[PDB]
């Protein structure tokens, strides 16, 4: 339709923003513990999928918790300590989150450049309708 | 349903409980 380009770019921007927000939240909760109701904090990731309308935009179905084992730290003085006196610290890969943020920023800038070019082309298109 | 669509009713207000009630 020559106008689904805007939809594709907007979906890409929204997905990149979601992924960046997830990475930022993980970085903020890198060294947290004992969230609400006492359950240990676990990191989360996002999964990108394409919308087969062929070629289509990107979407994020749901946020998936990481299955990597939590860090078990010996500290009996914490009420969260089990019979072995261990507390469950969250699994956060700082380098992984930095790389994810870098990738999200680069994809966002590429998509905004594509939007700029297509907007210029579409503005120039209407000059022939007169 | 899908974010960014049109709905006839507002979403419930957001809250961030520090501790569960």
């Amino acid at each position: 339709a020559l106008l689904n380009i805007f939809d594709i770019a907007g979906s890409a921007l929204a997905a990149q923003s979601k992924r960046l927000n997830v990475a930022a939240s993980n970085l903020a909760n890198a060294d947290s513990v004992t969230g609400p109701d006492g359950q240990p904090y676990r990191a989360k990731q996002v999964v990108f999928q394409v919308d087969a309308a062929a070629t289509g935009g990107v979407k994020v179905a749901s946020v998936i918790e990481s299955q990597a084992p939590e860090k078990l730290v010996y500290e009996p003085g914490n009420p969260l300590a089990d019979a072995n006196g261990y507390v469950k610290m969250p699994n956060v890969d700082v380098v992984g989150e930095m790389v994810n943020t870098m990738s999200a920023s680069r994809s966002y800038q590429a998509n905004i450049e594509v939007l700029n070019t297509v907007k210029s082309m579409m503005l120039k298109t209407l000059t022939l309708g007169q | 349903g899908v974010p960014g669509a049109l709905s006839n009713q507002p979403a419930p207000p957001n809250e961030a409980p520090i501790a569960t009630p």
Binding site: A1, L2, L3, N4, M122, T125, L126, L128, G129 | -
Partner: protein, 70 residues
């Protein structure tokens, strides 16, 4: 001499179809690529210009042939 009637009906149908396509595109449903509508609009405008030029030429000829002096 209904051939001019047929031609004007055909060009009117063409421009009406172009208008219908433009309305369908502005309705916000995906069937148009923003290029076919503009091309059809240009073609309809050109056909209408040809028709009005033909009308002017024909009425001038009728005026001349009526201006005879027997």
């Amino acid at each position: 001499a209904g051939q001019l009637h047929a031609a004007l009906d055909r060009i009117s149908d063409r421009q009406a179809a172009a208008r219908v396509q433009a309305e369908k595109f502005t309705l916000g449903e995906p069937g148009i690529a923003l290029n076919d509508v503009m091309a059809d609009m240009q073609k309809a405008s050109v056909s209408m210009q040809m028709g009005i030029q033909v009308r002017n030429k024909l009425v001038a000829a009728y005026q001349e042939v009526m201006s005879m002096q027997v």
